[PDB]
Amino acid sequence: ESKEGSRSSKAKLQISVARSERLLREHGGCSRVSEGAAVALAAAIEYFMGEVLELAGNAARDSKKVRISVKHITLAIQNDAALFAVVGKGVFSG
Template identity: 50%
Template sequence: MKETKAERSGEGKGSRKGGGGRKGGGPKKKPVSRSVKAGLQFPVGRIGRYLKKGRYSQRVGTGAPVYLAAVLEHLATVLEYLAAEVLELAGNAARDNKRTQSRRRGDRRRRETQSREEKPKAGT
Protein backbone atom coordinates (compact mmCIF):
# COMPACT_ATOMS: atom_id res chain seq x y z
CA MET A 1 0.00 0.00 0.00
CA LYS A 2 1.38 3.38 -1.02
CA GLU A 3 1.62 6.33 1.40
CA THR A 4 -0.09 9.51 0.44
CA LYS A 5 1.69 12.83 0.45
CA ALA A 6 -0.18 13.91 3.61
CA GLU A 7 0.90 10.77 5.46
CA ARG A 8 4.56 11.26 4.48
CA SER A 9 4.52 14.87 5.76
CA GLY A 10 3.06 13.74 9.10
CA GLU A 11 -0.38 15.21 8.60
CA GLY A 12 -2.22 11.93 8.36
CA LYS A 13 -3.46 9.39 10.92
CA GLY A 14 -4.44 11.63 13.80
CA SER A 15 -1.43 13.91 13.97
CA ARG A 16 -2.06 17.61 14.38
CA LYS A 17 -1.52 20.05 11.59
CA GLY A 18 1.74 22.00 11.82
CA GLY A 19 3.26 19.59 14.39
CA GLY A 20 6.34 21.74 14.97
CA GLY A 21 6.81 20.68 18.59
CA ARG A 22 9.25 18.23 20.10
CA LYS A 23 9.76 14.98 18.25
CA GLY A 24 9.25 11.73 20.10
CA GLY A 25 7.79 13.25 23.26
CA GLY A 26 11.12 13.10 25.08
CA PRO A 27 12.11 15.12 28.12
CA LYS A 28 11.74 18.88 27.96
CA LYS A 29 14.97 20.83 27.40
CA LYS A 30 16.22 22.99 30.24
CA PRO A 31 15.96 26.70 29.34
CA VAL A 32 19.30 28.41 28.73
CA SER A 33 19.60 32.06 29.75
CA ARG A 34 20.93 34.70 27.41
CA SER A 35 23.76 35.35 29.85
CA VAL A 36 24.91 31.73 29.52
CA LYS A 37 24.57 31.87 25.74
CA ALA A 38 26.73 35.01 25.64
CA GLY A 39 29.20 33.61 28.18
CA LEU A 40 28.62 36.45 30.66
CA GLN A 41 28.17 36.69 34.42
CA PHE A 42 26.03 39.83 34.29
CA PRO A 43 22.26 39.28 33.86
CA VAL A 44 21.31 40.06 30.27
CA GLY A 45 17.57 39.66 30.88
CA ARG A 46 17.55 42.03 33.84
CA ILE A 47 19.56 44.65 31.97
CA GLY A 48 17.14 44.38 29.04
CA ARG A 49 14.21 44.82 31.40
CA TYR A 50 15.81 47.92 32.93
CA LEU A 51 16.47 49.36 29.47
CA LYS A 52 12.80 48.92 28.53
CA LYS A 53 11.50 50.14 31.87
CA GLY A 54 13.77 53.20 31.90
CA ARG A 55 12.24 54.64 28.73
CA TYR A 56 15.61 55.29 27.12
CA SER A 57 14.08 54.70 23.69
CA GLN A 58 10.84 53.48 22.18
CA ARG A 59 12.31 50.10 21.24
CA VAL A 60 15.28 48.13 22.53
CA GLY A 61 17.06 45.74 20.16
CA THR A 62 17.84 42.17 21.14
CA GLY A 63 21.59 42.74 21.05
CA ALA A 64 21.59 45.91 23.16
CA PRO A 65 21.31 44.28 26.61
CA VAL A 66 23.90 41.65 25.65
CA TYR A 67 26.37 44.32 24.56
CA LEU A 68 25.71 46.46 27.63
CA ALA A 69 26.16 43.45 29.94
CA ALA A 70 29.48 42.65 28.26
CA VAL A 71 30.68 46.24 28.66
CA LEU A 72 29.63 46.34 32.32
CA GLU A 73 31.35 43.02 32.99
CA HIS A 74 34.54 44.31 31.38
CA LEU A 75 34.42 47.49 33.49
CA ALA A 76 33.90 45.43 36.63
CA THR A 77 36.97 43.34 35.74
CA VAL A 78 39.08 46.47 35.22
CA LEU A 79 37.88 47.96 38.53
CA GLU A 80 38.67 44.71 40.32
CA TYR A 81 42.19 44.75 38.88
CA LEU A 82 42.72 48.40 39.90
CA ALA A 83 41.43 47.73 43.42
CA ALA A 84 43.85 44.81 43.77
CA GLU A 85 46.75 47.00 42.63
CA VAL A 86 45.84 49.80 45.07
CA LEU A 87 45.44 47.29 47.90
CA GLU A 88 48.84 45.78 47.18
CA LEU A 89 50.49 49.22 47.11
CA ALA A 90 48.76 50.21 50.35
CA GLY A 91 49.96 47.00 52.00
CA ASN A 92 53.52 47.63 50.85
CA ALA A 93 53.38 51.22 52.13
CA ALA A 94 52.00 50.07 55.50
CA ARG A 95 54.76 47.49 55.82
CA ASP A 96 57.45 50.05 54.96
CA ASN A 97 55.92 52.61 57.35
CA LYS A 98 56.05 50.08 60.19
CA ARG A 99 59.77 49.62 59.60
CA THR A 100 60.47 53.35 59.69
CA GLN A 101 58.49 53.74 62.92
CA SER A 102 60.49 51.01 64.65
CA ARG A 103 63.71 52.67 63.51
CA ARG A 104 62.51 55.98 64.92
CA ARG A 105 61.80 54.35 68.26
CA GLY A 106 65.37 53.09 68.34
CA ASP A 107 66.61 56.59 67.53
CA ARG A 108 64.54 58.04 70.39
CA ARG A 109 66.04 55.55 72.85
CA ARG A 110 69.52 56.41 71.65
CA ARG A 111 68.81 60.13 72.00
CA GLU A 112 67.47 59.65 75.52
CA THR A 113 70.59 57.78 76.60
CA GLN A 114 72.80 60.39 74.98
CA SER A 115 70.95 63.24 76.70
CA ARG A 116 71.48 61.61 80.10
CA GLU A 117 75.20 61.59 79.56
CA GLU A 118 76.97 64.88 79.95
CA LYS A 119 78.08 66.37 76.71
CA PRO A 120 81.23 68.42 76.60
CA LYS A 121 80.53 72.11 76.16
CA ALA A 122 81.78 73.68 73.00
CA GLY A 123 85.05 75.57 73.38
CA THR A 124 86.11 74.02 76.70
Protein backbone atom coordinates (compact mmCIF):
# COMPACT_ATOMS: atom_id res chain seq x y z
CA GLU A 1 0.00 0.00 0.00
CA SER A 2 2.25 2.72 -1.41
CA LYS A 3 1.07 4.48 -4.58
CA GLU A 4 4.04 6.89 -4.80
CA GLY A 5 6.15 5.07 -7.36
CA SER A 6 6.36 1.98 -9.53
CA ARG A 7 6.99 -1.68 -8.74
CA SER A 8 10.76 -1.16 -8.99
CA SER A 9 10.58 1.89 -6.71
CA LYS A 10 8.49 -0.02 -4.15
CA ALA A 11 11.09 -2.80 -3.98
CA LYS A 12 13.99 -0.28 -4.23
CA LEU A 13 15.33 -2.06 -7.32
CA GLN A 14 16.92 -0.44 -10.36
CA ILE A 15 15.87 -3.31 -12.63
CA SER A 16 12.27 -2.75 -13.71
CA VAL A 17 9.93 -5.37 -12.26
CA ALA A 18 7.41 -4.91 -15.09
CA ARG A 19 9.93 -5.83 -17.79
CA SER A 20 11.17 -8.82 -15.77
CA GLU A 21 7.58 -10.01 -15.34
CA ARG A 22 7.08 -9.73 -19.11
CA LEU A 23 10.07 -12.02 -19.67
CA LEU A 24 8.74 -14.53 -17.13
CA ARG A 25 5.07 -14.51 -18.15
CA GLU A 26 5.52 -14.37 -21.94
CA HIS A 27 8.21 -17.09 -22.00
CA GLY A 28 5.58 -19.73 -22.77
CA GLY A 29 6.31 -21.64 -19.57
CA CYS A 30 3.18 -21.40 -17.44
CA SER A 31 -0.29 -19.88 -17.49
CA ARG A 32 -0.16 -18.00 -14.17
CA VAL A 33 2.65 -15.86 -12.72
CA SER A 34 2.43 -14.53 -9.17
CA GLU A 35 3.40 -11.05 -8.00
CA GLY A 36 6.25 -12.27 -5.79
CA ALA A 37 7.96 -14.12 -8.64
CA ALA A 38 8.22 -10.89 -10.64
CA VAL A 39 10.00 -9.03 -7.82
CA ALA A 40 12.30 -11.97 -7.08
CA LEU A 41 13.38 -12.36 -10.72
CA ALA A 42 14.22 -8.65 -10.98
CA ALA A 43 16.35 -8.79 -7.83
CA ALA A 44 18.32 -11.81 -9.08
CA ILE A 45 19.20 -10.00 -12.31
CA GLU A 46 19.99 -6.79 -10.42
CA TYR A 47 22.45 -8.25 -7.90
CA PHE A 48 24.67 -10.08 -10.38
CA MET A 49 24.78 -7.33 -12.98
CA GLY A 50 25.97 -5.17 -10.12
CA GLU A 51 28.72 -7.77 -9.77
CA VAL A 52 29.60 -7.50 -13.47
CA LEU A 53 29.49 -3.69 -13.47
CA GLU A 54 31.71 -3.58 -10.37
CA LEU A 55 34.34 -5.80 -11.98
CA ALA A 56 34.11 -4.04 -15.36
CA GLY A 57 34.47 -0.61 -13.75
CA ASN A 58 37.56 -1.70 -11.83
CA ALA A 59 39.01 -3.20 -15.02
CA ALA A 60 38.29 0.01 -16.94
CA ARG A 61 39.78 2.18 -14.18
CA ASP A 62 42.94 0.05 -14.12
CA SER A 63 43.29 0.63 -17.89
CA LYS A 64 43.14 4.45 -17.39
CA LYS A 65 39.87 4.67 -19.33
CA VAL A 66 36.66 6.31 -18.11
CA ARG A 67 34.33 4.41 -20.48
CA ILE A 68 33.46 0.73 -20.11
CA SER A 69 33.94 -1.05 -23.45
CA VAL A 70 33.31 -4.57 -24.73
CA LYS A 71 36.86 -5.74 -23.94
CA HIS A 72 36.59 -4.48 -20.35
CA ILE A 73 33.35 -6.44 -19.90
CA THR A 74 35.01 -9.50 -21.43
CA LEU A 75 38.18 -9.18 -19.32
CA ALA A 76 36.12 -8.95 -16.12
CA ILE A 77 34.44 -12.30 -16.78
CA GLN A 78 37.45 -14.65 -16.86
CA ASN A 79 38.97 -12.77 -13.90
CA ASP A 80 36.15 -14.21 -11.75
CA ALA A 81 35.89 -18.00 -11.67
CA ALA A 82 32.36 -17.94 -10.26
CA LEU A 83 30.99 -15.48 -12.82
CA PHE A 84 32.56 -17.28 -15.79
CA ALA A 85 30.67 -20.54 -15.18
CA VAL A 86 27.29 -18.87 -15.75
CA VAL A 87 28.11 -17.31 -19.14
CA GLY A 88 30.96 -19.54 -20.32
CA LYS A 89 28.94 -20.91 -23.24
CA GLY A 90 28.02 -17.40 -24.39
CA VAL A 91 29.48 -15.61 -27.41
CA PHE A 92 31.37 -12.60 -26.00
CA SER A 93 31.53 -10.87 -29.38
CA GLY A 94 34.38 -12.61 -31.18
